[PDB]
Amino acid sequence: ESYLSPAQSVKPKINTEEKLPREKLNPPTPSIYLESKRDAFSPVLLQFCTDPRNPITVIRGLAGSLRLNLGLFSTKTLVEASGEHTVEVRTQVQQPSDENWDLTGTRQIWPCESSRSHTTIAKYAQYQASSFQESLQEELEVLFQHHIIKFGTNIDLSDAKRWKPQLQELLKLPAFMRVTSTGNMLSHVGHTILGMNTVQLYMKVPGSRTPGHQENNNFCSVNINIGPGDCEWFAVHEHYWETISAFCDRHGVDYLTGSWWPILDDLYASNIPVYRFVQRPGDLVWINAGTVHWVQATGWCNNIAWNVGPLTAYQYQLALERYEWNEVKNVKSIVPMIHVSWNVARTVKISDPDLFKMIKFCLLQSMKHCQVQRESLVRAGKKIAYQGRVKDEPAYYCNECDVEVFNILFVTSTYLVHCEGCARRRSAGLQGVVVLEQYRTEELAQAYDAFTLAP
């Protein structure tokens, strides 16, 4: 009953059955330099970054190749743009890169301690600076003769007023890397998903860690290192994600919502190639769809990141797989995949045949599901009001199970929306439940038929 057709998979075929030698267990990270500025706008670049075979890619010195004014993202520029703006903090324990230990260094462990708290930007800038000066002093002695760290994470540069010049700068990027782009699936959500279709800022000190994960719904990520320190990246191909999740299960940590730092020897032991690379100031990281990754600051630095949704079959297939898998696991999918697919088909011409067949299949199933739901409600005497979508109306979600609710909305009262199960199970016969329809069969049917492959 999936929104996906297994026959249509464009996932690269990889055999783990054969033993793999060590050199391939440490693959080189695709690094790319940009002599011209139009290279960055070349299609071959986009073809490269989004190739399924290429889990992750570094674009070297792009912030100078287009003359991006990163300086603005400097901590100093930030503190005065707004210092009493606020910031999530992670309190962590500082460690060497490829390692994470119990309290004593007897053992390497998967669970990564990462406690939470809040400050302002100006406040964390104090800390980041003091921290640096301190490390300086302990070196201006030797000359003449557990570390607890705090990481400023997921800082929201969403307010396009306040952060005007900073955001304006990123317009200079090739379209597929931009925050907002007609060719960006995430631009077709119709509302703001903080950190995905808005920019997040990271203020790091050395040892500052972002633990193992895949992006929300397997969406591409674009990260720029502002400077002046470096970052170290580790990454695995989507293919191997369930094997990694299995480790999380054994070590008693939740794969999708838990804090975990992988044990590299485990992954080598399991025949899983790990990409290892350094990201220098002005280097852009492109994380392809579904790539497991984790990240350590080696110096003092800020990064900027957001999620992009290029219109490829791979990206799409993986967004849907994660969408369904999320709900199997009772985990909120923050990109409302069904509402997005309809928005896309109705607003964007698609020339790529494989991507076209995938969206078309999904819309079909969405229609059958709406059709089935309607009959049985009718069949059981339930009246369904018609509700219009208004302009810039968001997607909906079950107040209870967090699943996306599409087209047919169950409502109670100051009004709440539910999926059917959550409505029934809270009223046997749906008494005191209003039921709304947002798209009549014919609206969806016509939209569907209007949707054809562009040559």
């Binding site: 703001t192 903080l194 995905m196």
Partner: peptide, 11 residues
């Protein structure tokens, strides 16, 4: 709010 963030362990 749908929003991207870091996993957590304390606080």
């Amino acid at each position: 709010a749908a929003r991207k963030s870091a996993p957590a362990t304390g606080g």
